[PDB]
Symmetry: C3
Subunit: 213 residues, 3 copies
């Protein structure tokens, strides 16, 4: 049975949507496949679209995943690790601002370690993207929530920028931040990408997606 | 197969489905129904039977349409009175109503029990006690009243509440909530004909999002 | 075995949405059923809603289908042919403008031939709707894309009006054109329907759908 969204694209599924794939050890899982972007075959593990879901959540919630198939979600750190663990695949970040303006940014490999390793971000080459690089900064850094401080700052970046990310001191990207809708006076606590629209602009749409090498 | 399966969205949550979305359950009588499960709110496991989000669907509809259900899995819908009765007839389901205004304020109401009688009793609302909620109690008023639509006036008003207030609801004489009213988008001059909740944002403010959902005790 | 969205309606599915049906050839297809409009039971094969999907696409892409179950899509010419081949189905076209005024056109029968015949369009007589008739003009003409010009123009109409359609010389409807959002100065390159809002108005919503005659 189908193991990646790439497989499903290969089996003639051309419309984006939720399909079940089979995890290394046989667990059925409905993932969102993006069959459209950049050749198609992407498995989406994060999406922000309308601010209907609260992303300011604790460790246990990020671990198992949350949100809605109808709109916004986070697939879950366990699932994300399961998907990008054995073998390797690439990350694609997509961003649309409120004027209908598209930008992206691909890297050539992406993986997160398991819970014992605090979901460490393993990130390689920024290939290209109109949105620029604002994610390598966070390379080799442990995942943080508001109730598990594993960050580089002396104070809690997750709580400060209202999100859950691979926080150092602190961040150039904050895609799990608050849905602030465009420009905001508050500093760096929205759906922000430094090299893209900056620390005071919150995107309308964000998607993080992977595809096998 | 209609044994094996999940009977409520609560069952599906317990079976490790963590993302909200459309799943098929089996009603007390094995009939399989595809429902929207809210796995996120207040512990998760809610079956959503009403959803207003963007005004794309007309809720000003006749009796037959409310009976079988209408709208879209992609956006707004009413599950259908038959289904709603089937879902709530045996047992106690708590009810929760979730509301969001256009300035991003979120409000809710919660009730100990909720059930609607069958068609012969005109989908009579049987409402348990108000338990808590920022939105305030604007449903207790409608306890023990028949459902009404534009073409079937079962209210306690000499007029037709469903025509005056452009919805369908368990109107009394006439209302304190009108969640199936017109999608008027925020404050409106017209009186009480929007997606209104009296103790919430009053008779002149129509919310951006409303959801009604149920879950086993 | 449900063969059409009409079948699903008769079996008591009253909410519009994506359901899987079985084609005359037995392939299972997941389609958008419109259970609401004009008695319900329509299978939607084209949907424009917000301009999120690029419809300016090549032959291979139109053949297999593209877009998203969450928003805009084209079911795919192969699928459309498979759904229209045997018997005959009605066609309804629904159009919404930016003040939410709805229009429609309705045709007794509609079918597209297969790839060998270039998905040639076989349309029956105009029945009533208020949008007027802007498809009859296109009867008996192959489908053209930017990369497969089958029109009756010395140029490439798909390139001239940036869509893909049964172009003659050139068109009176262009529902796969650019999502230009209301009135546009450019000529006839939007989601246009001549007898509806003319060559300089691009609709907000467009849907093409079929149902057993
Ligand atoms: C729910 O509300 C009803 C009244 O509302 C109607 O019924 C409900 C189900 C909805 O369909 C509404 O839309 C309808 O409008 C209450 O019913 C009344 O209850 C009171 C007692 O609490 C009854 O009053 C008693 O009547 C006795 C005589 O009863 C018989 O005769 C009357 C006519 O007078 C007749 O209506 C009734 O059915 C009997 O046939 C009298 O001896 C006693 O002392 C007292 O006055 C009243 O009769 C009921 N009205 C009706 C129409 O039945 C429900 O009790 C209420 N339920 C709950 C759970 O609160
Ligand atoms: Ca710290
Ligand atoms: Ca009356
Ligand atoms: Ca030509």
């Amino acid at each position: 049975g189908p193991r990646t969204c790439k497989d499903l694209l290969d089996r003639g599924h051309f419309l984006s949507g939720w399909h079940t794939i089979y995890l290394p050890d046989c667990r059925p899982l409905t993932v969102l496949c993006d069959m459209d972007t950049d050749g198609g075959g992407w498995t989406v593990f994060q999406r922000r679209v309308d601010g209907s879901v609260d992303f300011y959540r604790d460790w246990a919630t990020y671990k198992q995943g949350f949100g809605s198939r109808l709109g916004e979600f986070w697939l879950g750190n366990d699932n994300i690790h399961a998907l990008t663990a054995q073998g390797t695949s690439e990350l694609r970040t997509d961003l649309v601002d409120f004027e209908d303006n598209y930008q992206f940014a691909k890297y050539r490999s992406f993986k997160v370690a398991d819970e014992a390793e605090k979901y460490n971000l393993v990130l390689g080459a920024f290939v290209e993207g109109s949105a620029g690089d604002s994610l390598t900064f966070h390379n080799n850094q442990s995942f943080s929530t508001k109730d598990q401080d594993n960050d580089l700052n002396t104070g809690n970046c997750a709580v400060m920028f209202q999100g859950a990310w691979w926080y150092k001191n602190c961040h150039t990207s904050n895609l799990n931040g608050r849905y602030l809708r465009g420009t905001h006076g508050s500093f760096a606590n929205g759906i922000n990408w430094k090299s893209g629209k900056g620390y005071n602009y919150s995107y309308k749409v964000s998607e993080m997606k992977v595809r096998p090498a």
